[PDB]
């Protein structure tokens, strides 16, 4: 639609005069079940979402797949848009297409402020997706150490079994992250849980890193 270009390019007076001339344009969606809030959150505009959320657009408007705007602001890295969506009362544990939560995608961008805002509002630290994977599996899958640490500021678990039976320690050792493995082990990781491949975290680690893993377990 035209409001997709208006909210995409950031036309201030064109969108203001367009909504003040026709209030239906705010509630109108395109063929992909995406309203102006999804385009203005995907673009990161503050004033446009302040006008749309000021008029009182439903914050829980999901698309065809189920992507809530809180995933767009969480993954977007825009702290102010998370302040606005959480200010309007967004669902901190909204279910998207693949059953994930905004914690996984805010963790993907390594945005600490968004994680504090979401987890402070009542987000589940151990929120599991369809594949039984939490934000620690993905943050550890890229190397977000401080994201896992601020996840541990909210008493998150470090032994979530993945769809293959892999704990966050398995993915930390698979990513060849030494400090992350030593920190997860030092903070309560289990080295005895095995996956579907029947491989312990010691065997998954190469270069004799399992000896210092279990060494730090006993030490």
């Amino acid at each position: 639609l035209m409001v997709c270009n208006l909210a995409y390019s950031g036309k201030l007076e064109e969108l203001k005069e367009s909504i003040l001339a026709d209030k239906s344009l705010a509630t109108r969606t395109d063929q992909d079940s995406r309203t102006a809030l999804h385009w203005a959150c995907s673009a990161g505009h503050t004033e446009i979402v302040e006008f749309l959320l000021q008029l009182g657009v439903p914050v829980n408007d999901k698309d065809d797949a189920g992507w809530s705007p809180l995933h767009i602001a969480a993954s977007a890295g825009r702290d102010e848009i998370v302040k606005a969506l959480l200010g309007k009362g967004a669902q901190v544990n909204a279910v998207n297409q693949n059953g994930c939560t905004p914690l996984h995608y805010a963790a993907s961008k390594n945005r600490h402020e968004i994680a504090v805002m979401l987890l402070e509002g009542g987000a589940n630290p151990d929120a599991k997706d369809h594949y039984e994977a939490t934000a620690m599996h993905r943050a550890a899958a890229k190397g977000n150490l401080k994201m896992i640490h601020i996840l541990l500021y909210y008493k998150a678990s470090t032994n979530i079994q993945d769809t293959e039976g892999n704990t966050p320690l398995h993915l930390a050792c698979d990513e060849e992250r030494v400090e992350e493995a030593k920190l997860l082990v030092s903070q309560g990781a289990s080295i005895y849980i095995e996956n579907k491949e029947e491989k312990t975290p010691l065997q998954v680690a190469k270069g004799g890193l399992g000896l210092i893993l279990k060494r730090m377990v006993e030490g």
């Binding site: 639609l1 035209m2 005069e17 367009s18 001339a21 026709d22």
Partner: protein
């Protein structure tokens, strides 16, 4: 259907004889919704070939005896696509637009010899920016205004 605007046209040309420009401001909401409605492609062509002659005929009456031309150039200069912003379905007509611009350059041709040196520079400096803002034309009037200005 244009049968609703036809009575407003042939009745408006009879009722609009001596009234000032304020009645045209009263006609702005009467013609805004009249231009917004009428999704018919070939039927509303008469409505657009009559209403524009009503408003430009009122422009002729307003420009007949006394003319300040400031509010006149501000009306069209500030209101170009006001009726084209609410309509999401552009009817791709381009049938009365050539008669629109050709009639505007015809009235400006009747007002271009010697009337008043002040509004001609702002009207021409406006329409040469309308050349750039158009981007879609038969390239006849756009050259006409700039060559009849270049001759001056």
């Amino acid at each position: 259907m244009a049968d609703g605007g036809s009575e407003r046209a042939d009745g408006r040309i009879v009722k609009m004889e001596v009234d000032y420009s304020a009645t045209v401001d009263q006609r702005l909401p009467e013609c805004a919704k009249l231009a917004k409605e009428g999704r018919l492609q070939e039927v509303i062509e008469t409505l657009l070939s009559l209403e524009k002659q009503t408003r430009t005929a009122s422009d002729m009456v307003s420009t007949s005896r006394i003319l300040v031309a400031v509010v006149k150039m501000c009306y069209e200069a500030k209101e170009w696509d006001l009726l084209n912003e609410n309509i999401m379905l552009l009817s791709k007509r381009r049938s009365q637009l050539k008669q629109a611009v050709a009639k505007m350059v015809q009235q400006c041709c009747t007002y271009v010899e010697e009337i008043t040196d002040l509004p001609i520079k702002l009207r021409l400096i406006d329409t040469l920016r309308m050349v750039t803002e158009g981007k879609i034309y038969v390239e006849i009037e756009r050259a006409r205004l700039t060559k009849t200005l270049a001759t001056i």
